[PDB]
Every structure is written in structure tokens, then in C-alpha cells.
Design a protein around this ligand. Structure first.
Ligand code: M3Q
Ligand code: ZN
Ligand code: ZN
Length: 229
């Protein structure tokens, strides 16, 4: 059930949940797909992650207008790399309230990103401080510890079997942990396992660079990360 919409791909995952996919021709790595989420919560839409670029992110909003036709109340982005935050200006131009881990917003300028408007902060156990995530509806935001990056955050969708690991989690057949340039290799395995423990009911694991998978994505990612230590 993939829907080609311009240069992007959209796939319904649940009655109120769709995955957005965008591509960037990155020299040395081919045309890399990146996934995020679109969630309808009653009369509004919530977005997880931008596309790689402003133009692609505007195209996500165009798809939302044509297929859902409800306002986008907010977006949350899951770390300060291009695939997750590269389209921040398009969200701001559209009047959408944007949220990121405080550390992502601090890192955004040096990473070439535009910061989100609002900062999420996290309790010692990883759960978002609820006052910093107002009106998130079914989105449950969890900081699992440093892994793919020090700022990576994850999102469960209450009322569904879906949890989103972003670039922390790779699929159950993945050959590597991908881009470790900003990774915490010592803590990766525990962070991947903490994501699994935060969302024990999630049987569909969504991630940045592979199609949705079973929880074997979590166990396999953690087992690969065991080897980094
Ligand atoms: O780490 P990601 O997935 O957020 C962004 C990304 C994806 C693929 C290859 C990369 C190479 C260098 C830097 N970033 C890359
Ligand atoms: Zn990244
Ligand atoms: Zn990635």
C-alpha cells in the first residue's frame, strides 16, 4: 500500500497513522530513504520528523492537506541530523508548532539545522517532562539514552501497536548500525534495549531507514551494538 506522491512515498500503518518517506541523493551513500510519521488525533494532525529538505517537507504538508485535510497542530523531531530536522523552516513557514529535545535544539546550528521552537526536557528515567510536551495527544516521547546520537529520542503512539525508534533502531536483518559518526558506541546497546522496555506493547517498530518490522528489530539492533563495546 505504498502511495507515490511526487518524490515521496506514504504508507498507511494503522487507521490513524501513516509513514512518510523522503530521499536524498547523498554522495558516497546513494539515494537514502528516511521515514517519519503522520498521526491523526481527532480533528488535528501530528507529525514526527521532517523530510530531508524544506521542499520535501512542504510536500508532506501538501499530502496531509489532500488526504486528511485537518490542521497540523505540531511536529516533534527526533535528533539534530538532516533526515529528521532538515525541513524545519517549512514547518515554521506553515505556522506549525515544533518540538525537539533541548539538546537537539542546542546542537541544531552547528549541525546546519534550524532549531525547533520548543524544547523537550526529560526526567532521569527517560520519560519526557509532560509540561514540555503539551497537547501531544497519543504521542509518548521517551529519551532512551545516547545511541545513534546523544540527543536521539523515540515516540510511542498510544492506542496503537506502533513505536518509532528513528535512527536508533535498524531492521532485524540489518548488516550494520549505519552512520556512527555522532554515536555513543559504549551506551548504544543499553539505549536500544531501553527503547524496547519503554514500549513493551509495541509490536510494530517503525524506524528511519527500513520498513516497519517486528520487535526483532530491537533485539537485533541491541545485539549488534553489544559488539561495539
Ligand atoms: O545519520 P543519519 O541517518 O541521521 C543521516 C545520514 C544518513 C546516511 C548516511 C550518512 C552519512 C553521513 C552523515 N549522515 C548520514
Ligand atoms: Zn542521525
Ligand atoms: Zn538515520
Amino acid at each position: 500500500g505504498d502511495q507515490r506522491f511526487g518524490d515521496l512515498v506514504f504508507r498507511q500503518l494503522a487507521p490513524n497513522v501513516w509513514q512518510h518517506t523522503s530521499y536524498l541523493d547523498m554522495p558516497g551513500f546513494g539515494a537514502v530513504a528516511s521515514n517519519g510519521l503522520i498521526v491523526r488525533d481527532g480533528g488535528r494532525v501530528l507529525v514526527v520528523d521532517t523530510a530531508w529538505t524544506d521542499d520535501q517537507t512542504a510536500q508532506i504538508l501538501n499530502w496531509i492537506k489532500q488526504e486528511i485535510n485537518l490542521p497540523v497542530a505540531l511536529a516533534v523531531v527526533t535528533h539534530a541530523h538532516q533526515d529528521k530536522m532538515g525541513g524545519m523552516d517549512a514547518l515554521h513557514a506553515a505556522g506549525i508548532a515544533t518540538y525537539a529535545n533541548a539538546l537537539s535544539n542546542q546542537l541544531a546550528p552547528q549541525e546546519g539545522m534550524v532549531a525547533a521552537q520548543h524544547s523537550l526536557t526529560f526526567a532521569a528515567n527517560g520519560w519526557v517532562e509532560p509540561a514540555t510536551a503539551p497537547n501531544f495527544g497519543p504521542l509518548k516521547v521517551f529519551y532512551p539514552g545516547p545511541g545513534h546520537t546523544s540527543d536521539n529520542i523515540t515516540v510511542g503512539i498510544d492506542g496503537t501497536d506502533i513505536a518509532f525508534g528513528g535512527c536508533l533502531i535498524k531492521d532485524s536483518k540489518a548488516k550494520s548500525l549505519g552512520n556512527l559518526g555522532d554515536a555513543d558506541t559504549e551506551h548504544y546497546a543499553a539505549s536500544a534495549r531501553a527503547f524496547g522496555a519503554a514500549f513493551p506493547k509495541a509490536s510494530m517498530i517503525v524506524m528511519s531507514h527500513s520498513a516497519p518490522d517486528s520487535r526483532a528489530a530491537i533485539t537485533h539492533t541491541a545485539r549488534m551494538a553489544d559488539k561495539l563495546r
